[PDB]
Amino acid sequence: MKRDGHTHTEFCPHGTHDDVEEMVLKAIELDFDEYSIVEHAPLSSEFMKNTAGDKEAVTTASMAMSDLPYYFKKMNHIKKKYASDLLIHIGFEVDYLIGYEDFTRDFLNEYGPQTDDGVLSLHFLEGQGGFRSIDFSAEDYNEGIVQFYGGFEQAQLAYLEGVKQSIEADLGLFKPRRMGHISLCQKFQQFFGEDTSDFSEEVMEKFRVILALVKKRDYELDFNTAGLFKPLCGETYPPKKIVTLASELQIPFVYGSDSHGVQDIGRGYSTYCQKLE
Ligand SMILES: [Co+2]
Ligand SMILES: [Mn+2]
Numbered sequence: 001m002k003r004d005g006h007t008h009t010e011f012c013p014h015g016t017h018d019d020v021e022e023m024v025l026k027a028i029e030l031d032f033d034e035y036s037i038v039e040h041a042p043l044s045s046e047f048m049k050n051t052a053g054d055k056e057a058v059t060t061a062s063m064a065m066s067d068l069p070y071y072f073k074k075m076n077h078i079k080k081k082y083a084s085d086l087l088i089h090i091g092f093e094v095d096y097l098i099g100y101e102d103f104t105r106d107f108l109n110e111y112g113p114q115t116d117d118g119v120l121s122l123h124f125l126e127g128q129g130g131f132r133s134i135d136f137s138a139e140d141y142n143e144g145i146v147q148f149y150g151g152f153e154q155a156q157l158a159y160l161e162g163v164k165q166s167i168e169a170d171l172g173l174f175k176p177r178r179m180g181h182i183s184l185c186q187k188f189q190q191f192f193g194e195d196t197s198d199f200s201e202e203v204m205e206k207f208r209v210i211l212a213l214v215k216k217r218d219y220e221l222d223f224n225t226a227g228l229f230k231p232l233c234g235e236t237y238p239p240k241k242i243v244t245l246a247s248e249l250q251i252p253f254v255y256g257s258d259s260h261g262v263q264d265i266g267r268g269y270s271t272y273c274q275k276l277e
């Protein structure tokens, strides 16, 4: 089978603004038979008052609540239009917002019934001046998070504590069961002279605790290839060492392109197949 569990649309303010239809036609050309549209869920307006760092990381993060009816209408149209070629699932990439579980639970209880798939992703941590982005830019990550936690490794461990909290969280019946790109702390790796070759024993132990809990919860992992195409990353989320531990625990992986346009569709698919073997 050939499944992409992680794609975005014209409803993503920071994407290419390519039409989802052109992305779906490209997925069919590359022989995908299953395809999840998991657009960024709208952020809590309370959360957005409590941020620092580049405002664009927050203003551009996701669509507004008022776009949701238009999002569901468009995606449901595309799902039916291409049903004979491609099984399309509709849902969200849901932010795990530390301290805003009530907002996320209320959102999932309201809109969860309109969805068929989901990814729960950590994109924001407490940092200098308030909540800060993990994935906006190397310089913003340095100033907001790395310097705040005391260094690249301290940032890794704060990030993994957030991931662990996302797995433990009670977000009700409609909580996604697929955890998004669980090594996103490596997106700007090379800016700090870091790579996946030298994870400390403490980082490794934190990954083992996270994988044991994923297995106990019967969750699965986003095998996310976007990192291969980020100029300061060069790695899958997660890397091979983590993939091997997860596979030994029989945690399922779903390939995720994290596509924000047509050119992203299918990217790193061969690397997914090989990295699993
Ligand atoms: Co995504
Ligand atoms: Mn995005």
Ligand SMILES: [Mn+2]
Residues within 6 Å of the ligand: 093, 121, 123, 180, 181
């Ligand atoms: Mn993400």
